[PDB]
Amino acid sequence: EVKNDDLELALKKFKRVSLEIRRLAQRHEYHLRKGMRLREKRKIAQKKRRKFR
């Protein structure tokens, strides 16, 4: 995140912010096939879809 001073609220959002930053940096910090490079995002989206319609 950019701000964090709350005791219990902002940390949970910061967790997903860090997860998003990791997902965004795990495609350009190391060169690889674009196949899996996009498959990771597509599979994350698919997993997030069917769990909660």
């Binding site: 995140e1 950019v2 912010v17 998003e20």
Partner: protein, 65 residues
């Protein structure tokens, strides 16, 4: 979601619509997908291109602040 789909114009352009942009854009300066924005598919690409222009236009940062 966008007012443009609710009025009918079939396109948008950067006329400093930043207000509605803040509904589509997280405070993290990253474009949320079609789910959050609420466009159907056409205004979705319109707001996508507008947000990308704003990135180019420096209306919205890429990530740097």
């Amino acid at each position: 979601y966008c007012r443009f789909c609710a009025i009918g114009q079939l396109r948008i352009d950067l006329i400093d619509d930043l207000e509605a942009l803040k509904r589509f854009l997280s405070p993290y300066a990253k474009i949320n997908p079609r789910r959050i924005t609420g466009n159907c598919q056409m205004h979705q690409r319109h707001v996508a291109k507008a947000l990308k222009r704003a990135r180019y236009l420096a209306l919205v940062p890429f990530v740097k602040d």
